[PDB]
Design an enzyme around this catalytic site. Sequence first.
Site, PDB file in Angstrom:
ATOM      1  N   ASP D  51      -4.805  13.308  63.480  1.00 17.66           N
ATOM      2  CA  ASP D  51      -6.214  13.612  63.666  1.00 17.66           C
ATOM      3  C   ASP D  51      -6.810  12.877  64.874  1.00 17.66           C
ATOM      4  OD1 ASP D  51      -8.098  15.384  62.728  1.00 17.66           O
ATOM      5  OD2 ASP D  51      -9.165  13.831  61.590  1.00 17.66           O
ATOM      6  N   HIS D  86     -14.223  11.843  60.631  1.00 13.23           N
ATOM      7  CA  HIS D  86     -12.874  11.858  60.063  1.00 13.23           C
ATOM      8  C   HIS D  86     -12.126  10.552  60.273  1.00 13.23           C
ATOM      9  CE1 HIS D  86     -12.698  16.576  60.163  1.00 13.23           C
ATOM     10  NE2 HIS D  86     -13.700  16.103  59.440  1.00 13.23           N
ATOM     11  N   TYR D  90     -10.747   8.049  57.210  1.00 12.38           N
ATOM     12  CA  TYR D  90      -9.348   7.665  56.983  1.00 12.38           C
ATOM     13  C   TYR D  90      -9.201   6.140  56.963  1.00 12.38           C
ATOM     14  CZ  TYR D  90      -7.390  12.431  57.513  1.00 12.38           C
ATOM     15  OH  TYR D  90      -7.055  13.751  57.303  1.00 12.38           O
ATOM     16  N   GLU D 149      -4.567  22.232  62.938  1.00 12.77           N
ATOM     17  CA  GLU D 149      -5.708  22.360  62.019  1.00 12.77           C
ATOM     18  C   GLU D 149      -5.398  23.114  60.725  1.00 12.77           C
ATOM     19  OE1 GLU D 149      -8.637  20.894  62.549  1.00 12.77           O
ATOM     20  OE2 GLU D 149      -8.937  20.714  64.676  1.00 12.77           O
ATOM     21  N   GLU D 183     -11.392  20.950  58.899  1.00 10.08           N
ATOM     22  CA  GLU D 183     -10.216  21.416  59.667  1.00 10.08           C
ATOM     23  C   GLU D 183     -10.001  22.924  59.516  1.00 10.08           C
ATOM     24  OE1 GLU D 183     -10.226  18.905  61.240  1.00 10.08           O
ATOM     25  OE2 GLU D 183      -9.285  17.130  60.420  1.00 10.08           O
ATOM     26  N   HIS D 186     -12.407  24.550  61.844  1.00 12.80           N
ATOM     27  CA  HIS D 186     -11.931  24.277  63.204  1.00 12.80           C
ATOM     28  C   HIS D 186     -10.811  25.245  63.577  1.00 12.80           C
ATOM     29  CE1 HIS D 186     -13.299  19.751  62.894  1.00 12.80           C
ATOM     30  NE2 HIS D 186     -14.307  20.600  62.786  1.00 12.80           N
TER      31      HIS D 186
HETATM   32 MN   LIG Z   1     -10.158  15.743  61.707  1.00 10.15          MN
HETATM   33 MN   LIG Z   2     -10.157  19.324  63.279  1.00  4.49          MN
END
Ligand SMILES: [Mn+2]
Ligand SMILES: [Mn+2]
EC number: 1.17.4.1
Lengths: 683, 683, 289, 289
Positions: D51, D86, D90, D149, D183, D186
């Site tokens: 990512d 994002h 994480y 993605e 995602e 995306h």
């Molecule tokens: Mn992401």
């Molecule tokens: Mn993405």
Amino acid sequence: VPKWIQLNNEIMIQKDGKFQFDKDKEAVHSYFVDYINQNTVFFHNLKEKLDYLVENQYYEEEFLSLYSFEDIKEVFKTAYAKKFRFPSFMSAFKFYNDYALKTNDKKKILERYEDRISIVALFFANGDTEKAKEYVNLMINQEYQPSTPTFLNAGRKRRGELVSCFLLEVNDSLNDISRAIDISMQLSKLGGGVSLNLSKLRAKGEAIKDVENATKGVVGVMKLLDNAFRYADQMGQRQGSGAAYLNIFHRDINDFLDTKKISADEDVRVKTLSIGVVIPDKFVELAREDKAAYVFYPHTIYKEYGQHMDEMDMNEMYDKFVDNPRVKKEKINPRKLLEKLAMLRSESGYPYIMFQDNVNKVHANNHISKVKFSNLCSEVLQASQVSSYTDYDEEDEIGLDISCNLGSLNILNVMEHKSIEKTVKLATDSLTHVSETTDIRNAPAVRRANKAMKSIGLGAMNLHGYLAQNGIAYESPEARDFANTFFMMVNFYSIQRSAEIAKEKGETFDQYEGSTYATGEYFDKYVSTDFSPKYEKIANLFEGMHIPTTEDWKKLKAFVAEHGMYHSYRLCIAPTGSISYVQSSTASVMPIMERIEERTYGNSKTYYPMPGLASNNWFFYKEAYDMDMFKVVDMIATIQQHIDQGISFTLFLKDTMTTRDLNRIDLYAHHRGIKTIYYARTK
Amino acid sequence: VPKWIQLNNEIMIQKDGKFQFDKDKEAVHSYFVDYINQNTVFFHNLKEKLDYLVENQYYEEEFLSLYSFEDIKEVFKTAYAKKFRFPSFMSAFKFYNDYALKTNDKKKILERYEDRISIVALFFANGDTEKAKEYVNLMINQEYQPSTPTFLNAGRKRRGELVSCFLLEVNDSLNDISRAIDISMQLSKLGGGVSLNLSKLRAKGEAIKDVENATKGVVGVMKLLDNAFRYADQMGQRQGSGAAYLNIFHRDINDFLDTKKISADEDVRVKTLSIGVVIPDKFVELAREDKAAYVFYPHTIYKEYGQHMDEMDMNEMYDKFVDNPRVKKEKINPRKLLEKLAMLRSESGYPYIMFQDNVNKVHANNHISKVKFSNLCSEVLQASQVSSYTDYDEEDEIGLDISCNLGSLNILNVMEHKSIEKTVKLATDSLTHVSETTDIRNAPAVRRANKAMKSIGLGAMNLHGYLAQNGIAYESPEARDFANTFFMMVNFYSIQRSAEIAKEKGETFDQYEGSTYATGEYFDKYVSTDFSPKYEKIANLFEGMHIPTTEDWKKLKAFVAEHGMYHSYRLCIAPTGSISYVQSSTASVMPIMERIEERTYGNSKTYYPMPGLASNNWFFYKEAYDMDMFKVVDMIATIQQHIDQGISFTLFLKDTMTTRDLNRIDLYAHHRGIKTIYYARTK
Amino acid sequence: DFTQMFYNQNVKQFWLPEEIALNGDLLTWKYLGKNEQDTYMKVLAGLTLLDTEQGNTGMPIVAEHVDGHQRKAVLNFMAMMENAVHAKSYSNIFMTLAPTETINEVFEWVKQNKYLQKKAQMIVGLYKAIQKDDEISLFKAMVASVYLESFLFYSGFYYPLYFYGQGKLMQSGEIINLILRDEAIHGVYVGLLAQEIYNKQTEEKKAELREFAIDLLNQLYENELEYTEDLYDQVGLSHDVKKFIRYNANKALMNLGFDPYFEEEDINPIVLNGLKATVEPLKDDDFYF
Amino acid sequence: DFTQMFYNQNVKQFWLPEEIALNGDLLTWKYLGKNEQDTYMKVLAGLTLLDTEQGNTGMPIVAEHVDGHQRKAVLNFMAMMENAVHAKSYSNIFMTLAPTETINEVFEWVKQNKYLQKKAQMIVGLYKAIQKDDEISLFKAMVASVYLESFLFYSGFYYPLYFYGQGKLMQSGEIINLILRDEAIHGVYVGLLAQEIYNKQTEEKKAELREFAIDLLNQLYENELEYTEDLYDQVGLSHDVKKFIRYNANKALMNLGFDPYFEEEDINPIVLNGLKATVEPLKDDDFYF
Ligand SMILES: [Mn+2]
Ligand SMILES: [Mn+2]
Ligand SMILES: Nc1ncnc2c1ncn2[C@@H]1O[C@H](COP(=O)(O)OP(=O)(O)OP(=O)(O)O)[C@@H](O)[C@H]1O
Ligand SMILES: Nc1ncnc2c1ncn2[C@@H]1O[C@H](COP(=O)(O)OP(=O)(O)OP(=O)(O)O)[C@@H](O)[C@H]1O
Ligand SMILES: Cc1cn([C@H]2C[C@H](O)[C@@H](COP(=O)(O)OP(=O)(O)OP(=O)(O)O)O2)c(=O)[nH]c1=O
Ligand SMILES: [Mg+2]
Ligand SMILES: [Mg+2]
Ligand SMILES: [Mn+2]
Ligand SMILES: [Mn+2]
């Protein structure tokens, strides 16, 4: 990918610069030698098949009990003796995916085309083996096609209703609105498309018992109906489809139209309810003269005159409405309203346009009622009387809610067999049977109108297919001459069959005596004008068939005067969307949208060429969008002069043309006598 | 800014560190010297006033015709002899803005407080001048207050129904759903709040005529009801208010709850439809033991057992449902569901919580039916029988739909006059009269249950006001002792009046013989437990009034056994939203939310201190949010032990407390015998 | 020492133009003279152009060359605000107040306006001249960005603020104040990054960088004067706006760690007036009392 | 035809890490076996590393080469979500579940891991190969982006969804579900941009681009199978994870307007439980014929 799918996709792979149309035929063979014959359920004989379908609640046993098994076997043998073959893959695919009877888990095929046709014929005949064989020969030759409800559901235990469309009149009351919502849900549960006339409902800002600016207008009822149709969506299989019709002189007409604007707010936007606009000749006259028009509040008019605004002629009462101070009205620009209609139809294809005066200048049952609205497909144009649904523990005054049974003649197959008369009479008998066996226990006005009016709709399909396969351009005057002659023949034989049924049953439709059929006015243009073909090619096309003359029409007029007519309405040309695939026919009397249509099913794509498309008739299969809409209007008016109800007339527009072109097409349709306009589909 | 508004806003201006409460009184004078008297229509005599009001369709002729003009004048003179003065500006403002009769142009005042009270008394007495004078003395002493519908509409021709709480049972059919929508629209048109039980409706993914995955569940019905309530909004005056109740063991319970989440989509969320959840003791036991629960498909249970899921006792039926393979169910975590309920109540105050077994372990009419759901305010708890609304031209099976009659005792005014017995009996008589004069022609089950059950709701208000003006904390054990004694006397005199009416008219409510009143079980706790005050202060509060003992309760039990009981239900404590202002009282038996409340009317600000608020009782007027919700639950349970129906019980939470605290309050309410929980208002 | 607090400030300032209903400005807009409406449209169009390039080019390119995932996250967020929030908000304002033809005309006007093209040419040229691992080219682009954030926007901001301060066009004005609040923190942040690079240089190099910054400011300033006169002469405000842009030029210099360049002046006082619940699981002891 | 619609859906899905309290995951984390904790850590690090490439390179490089102001704004918004939302999410999950030393070691391991590196470098290679004004190289990078993605993340997403569907690690599972939802959109959006380029090509060039896409998919898929066995054999899940990879590969292909490559398979039910015409006025004489 399946073998038949590859063979069907092989059509577009050109060989020597030409489409491989014959590959389509191969596909059907594959589709039968690899899927249909393997997925079909075979029994030792017809007895075991019928018993299995009866005990497993697939078939109604009552209609099969009217025949001895020998007669049913003879009917099935007559169906299978034709050795009917689907000429295109898509015809068989559409039948076996949408109309062939499958098991409960839908893993196997229980009904072939011949089995379905035999069952429908046995249901139609009602115990007559010879009549059942006649229906079998009519349907296996594909001369006549019962509507999707009738063809799919005839003789089935798990069936819905055989009636396709229902039209409801909504009175201006909360009780009537709630009853209309209930009946709409009930009829959508039965699978039929429901159309509701909202012109009697008082507009927004009207008084509910002396408290003013209280009503939500037709938009609130529209939202209620939209939610009702969303809820009643054929048990989640087919999305619930409803239509709302409003007179253009209703004050809410703008808000009505604003329900279909793409920028409408969620509290106004309605998405599962089609909209139609009923335009009297007065509105077109006001727009033509550029004089500012007035939309009216229905409740004030009802209070002043005792009748609803749509219950009387606007062409004679508009000035009285305007000059009456006790009638409330709002100023509008009729040309701006027309431009709004054109813009809305360009954006979304809505509203449906119903030219009320065009409908009622030739309407044969104006004594019963004027036609105030149309159906969901804008081809049913019948008299309706509003119902007075009163409070609980009070008797309701049940009116007439329109409902007719659909059935289409395949023009190519009918004329190839030279059997206009026989096909029309047999189709009229089948539609009469469908009306007689229809009994709806939750729509009282629909039931009463079905019992009294006895209205049926006999349509036609494959007009463009027949014209293109015979080397006639759809826009040519020869095509209009053929349509004139063919539909005059259809009207003649439909009237003859209706009068014969009235004679054999000793009964006519309710209030027939006041109709133009009884007075002989309806036959005027038929007893003074000859509708025989004016071109030698069309006359040759009609060879072997007795084209009725003015003398035959005079004899038919005398016969009707002596015996009456069983059906208030006989002919209505429905769109015939998916059942036209099975018949290998072009949809309705409309010109083809495309020569070869690419449709995606599952993860695969299929190409359906138009029936009979080839190199020699490629340019005769002219696409509708490439056609002049004025000549299509001319064709539809030529057909409409012989059709007592309306025709689902879809406008096929190019992206380049403006809303002014759409307005010009609409005004030419109104000028030419077009009763209704269905859709504005833009390429 | 008007002078009275300045005098009212001068309250917050602190003099010597104290609020100028007395200034409010001056404001009232200004509000009457500057506005009320100037805009009040005056007549030369009462005869002219009555003639003008009757002729101009303000009043009804029928109720005034039962008296001679001398009797009406005497009743009006009795009303005006009190020389009643509103003690606070907000009382007079609320009366003359919400309840006082105004001209059609809404610029003049036709009714004073005494005029409205006299008219309501004359309507109540139904021709008895002495009874009318008794009612006038009851209402001008402000001991009893008819509900907003009764107080506002009694004696007025342009009026809604006098009942505004309606409970509907919806059977699992499209006909029943459409009828429920229609009845909800008709009752919202009458101005009533409609509650619908949706537990009998089959969940999403159930079979309709043996086709699988067809039902839309209760969420589609909720969407339909929400649209119906939006449409029917009292002729565009108030927002249409409706409630939907679902059993927590219904499978749709999550989707039901999902209708109130902010993240819910537009096709899921219902905005004008309140939701309540019925929680049987089995769900609480499953959550307590952390055993995974099962939410059942109602239609499978109905097919297996022939009865609806909510029609049988889940405590004894849950194991059989789980062990039955033919009953379809889904696994859920009851503790997760409780946390979801607490989170939803924190976000929006929804759903209402009904503890089914808490209601039904003291329900006197379980033989008729168990209480399956509550009203829009979650205080009406009565037996209801579902109706079978069949197709058209088919007789419906009319059941019982709850509609009780609201009216509130002012505890402060009642107890300072030492007139618990007289006020309770007169309020019972007035509620009986209003129930008998209610005739709804569009709700068959509501009308049938009103005729049969004769259920009324006699509530109480100004509990916290009375306690604070007497130096008693709402959470103190003395307050609960007073509530116990006062509401036991209220129950005693309500039962005595019901039995006296039954003896006089010679009739009881339908199916009374099976009730616990007839068997004497209802009086068990009353013939064994003495409810006299345990504190000397409360006993001195009750000085001058006879407190019913165990011997008196035994005599009442014998009297009920001999003569029966006229009302199936007598007592229910409604929220009493706006009538508490006019009566200068705290709302319902709830603790006050704010000591002084700030409101915005038009572009002006106004300040309402709680009645009797001063420096001495500022501490005793503790705000509800600052209070311990466990002690509020204890007080509400103490009151509920003497109320046959429920109490509108709103939780008052701080923003600091989490969903665990809300769940703990709910579980303590369930443990303490609380029947319903209304709202979770977060400060 | 600062990125984390800028990260938190930027994300807590997140907004969308749709949060502000604009139909309330309809009447005060209708009431303005044709000259006033023209200047207003053009002013916002000039702002739209600047934010378009700051979002498409300026912020992403600086993000690419600045080291550190947190610094990149702040710069990426600022870039998103420029084109996904700020530039778009102007279209929300235009679509409310103006008919489509007037909107079309003003966007055509930005393309052909020589001062707006010159300032875009100069600023974007410096962005596109950044060379990987070359801190001096990066510094020059950061100076350009600070001048865009803290100086160039202000000839545009003046007019919405001028109206807001008189109680006119207050919904549009609310949007503009939110945009201005963002640009102020964007200018400070980029200024701090520029100072980091400047502080690494020799005294001789620093002297050259100050020359670059001052020469660039003067060149932009002279162009902005002509732009200001072109827009504001028809509404009588050019001299007032000029004082405002000089005020903000000093703020831009300060964001870069430099001394103010213009003398203090009194700014129009009108323009100055223009400036779920916590969830706990249920314990087994909560079911017993 | 689509950018404004995707703009709306993107901005209305905006969220921040702070919204989900993570500490309550420790109440189920402590009850997992060593292999379960090991797999989870490794999967999480895999997702984090991939990512980061998408935030630093993938989205910004596509935003740079795509023409259109509105597309650049949507792409900027997506890049912002990668870097600002994002990446922080994480990190938050990691810091909650493992001590600092354990996090550093897992990232060292996953950084050296052959199957993670193979796919990470294959994707990055295609982003680095984009050439200015060459739509073919842009398309190839878009294909790589859609594959990341809509496909490559899912061998990783499987495990958090598997726990989430069982009532374990619900707070971090909620976070992962929000990330996955971003995602998905995306992948769909970049897919539409790739189809736009594809549709501008000749038939021979189209066939060549299809071969490229299928060949790339095959390389990535064969490495995913190895990646899957390497992580999931120790917890006995590889068979079901493989079905989930193929199902998501088919979605990625459909995003690029291509036919599904793999036969339809059912997915693990626990993971499933976790988962305007021109207006022209009437001119009169249009009413006469
Ligand atoms: Mn992401
Ligand atoms: Mn993405
Ligand atoms: N186009 C088609 N339409 C309908 N049924 C078809 C079609 N093609 C094949 N079938 C069915 O599949 C069977 C396969 O037989 P096919 O048409 O190949 O010829 P056959 O074995 O020589 O016999 P026959 O043509 O006399 O039925 C047919 O008998 C028929 O039942
Ligand atoms: N607080 C109040 N509540 C209700 N009505 C009031 C109030 N104050 C004044 N009024 C109305 O205004 C009138 C004037 O009352 P005021 O205080 O001036 O003296 P009064 O001796 O009660 O007057 P009156 O001769 O009207 O009886 C009252 O009769 C009453 O109708
Ligand atoms: C009750 C109600 C009616 N209406 C509108 C819709 C109906 O077409 C119209 C008629 O309602 P009715 O049911 O006829 O009301 P009414 O008979 O009591 O009043 P009136 O004597 O004037 O007929 O009122 C609303 O818009 N909202 C409502 O809530
Ligand atoms: Mg009426
Ligand atoms: Mg049923
Ligand atoms: Mn900006
Ligand atoms: Mn900025």
